[PDB]
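Sample 1 of the test manifest.
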Amino acid sequence: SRLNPTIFEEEEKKVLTRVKGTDVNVVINFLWNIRNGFTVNAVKSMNELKNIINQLEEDLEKLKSFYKNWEEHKNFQGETLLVLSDLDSTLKVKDLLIEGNDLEKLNYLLDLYIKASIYDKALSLARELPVAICLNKVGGGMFDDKNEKYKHCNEIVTSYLRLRYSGLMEFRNTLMHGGLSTDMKPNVDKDGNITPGKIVTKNKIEDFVKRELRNYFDKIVNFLSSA
Amino acid sequence: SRLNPTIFEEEEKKVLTRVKGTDVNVVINFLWNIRNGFTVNAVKSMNELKNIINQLEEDLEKLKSFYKNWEEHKNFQGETLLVLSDLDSTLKVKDLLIEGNDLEKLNYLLDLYIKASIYDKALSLARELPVAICLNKVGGGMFDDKNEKYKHCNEIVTSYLRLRYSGLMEFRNTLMHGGLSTDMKPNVDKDGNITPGKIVTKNKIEDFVKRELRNYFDKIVNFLSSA
């Protein structure tokens, strides 16, 4: 915002105007929604982001060319605000994007949560995405108990998960409620000291989501296609 | 039982002994279980029945040959108890039989109930057979609420039926509870006169089971295979 050279060529200004207008705030918000589990919103932003980076690529090629032939763009010789590395590092957000319907975008996000080791968000998405998949097959509906299509769709995935994927459902609720919960059954003393109940290890959770969650999810979705 | 000729040849006696021993009571019991909806028991009897008729065929061929060459078996010339038509008509029970596991035998029975126009029994079997199909896929279990595998398996088929096959579930409960029920909502007067609630027609029920029940059931089972 605070970047404006006093003397600027027609081609320099034309591309700097584009650079000054890069919505870095939309990228930060995208990462915020992903971290805090606002999965629908993150996925809805994907197309907007796709355009943000498609332009940033165009600007980076032009700026890269400018700095490669730096002898012709001596107007930038004193500038300290435009840092090529800051913009080039931002282009990595291109990896977080995919094309397709919002369900396919959420499916990709599940894999992103797995790679990033965000166990809580990965397991909740693996639990709720098959309900949406189911809802889509039935012509659509809203995630609300008053919606009949949702009521039955949720009952199907919940009972199928409790029937075949008992582990998935257990890890999900434990990570969702944390340490102080009925899901972990800790014991509080007269002295104010707590002794954990189930003491679920770092390895059992890491191994399950990193090695089984995707294979399990793909089988759950495979089953729910026939619906 | 009351059939015994005074003079009997070695080949005549050998085959009459077999005829006298035909378990017609097992056939009557088979038809009783089918009519009263004891579907598991009817299906379990199928192999026994298969042997009953396999022998009755053998005896009928020999007796038919005896009566075709009646001049050689003049010992039967006065007999009134052995009626070829009674035994030959019994061989029609061969059509009610099929080979395969008890689930495949129950599947065939569903089609038998459809052809026979036993709407009540057909719809209850169409509702409960997918639970057993589901139970089998999960390694087996007992039809009891204390059985976890059953609990979830039933919840899946019940919610899938309420989600996609709303009609099937409605006709089932109506036929199961009959006229005087909450399923039909009749109204009783001060005078002791009742006015039906939903008045579901003979045609809507006939058309549904005779034209849609099998296509619908086959899709329900097709879905539950992926489980």
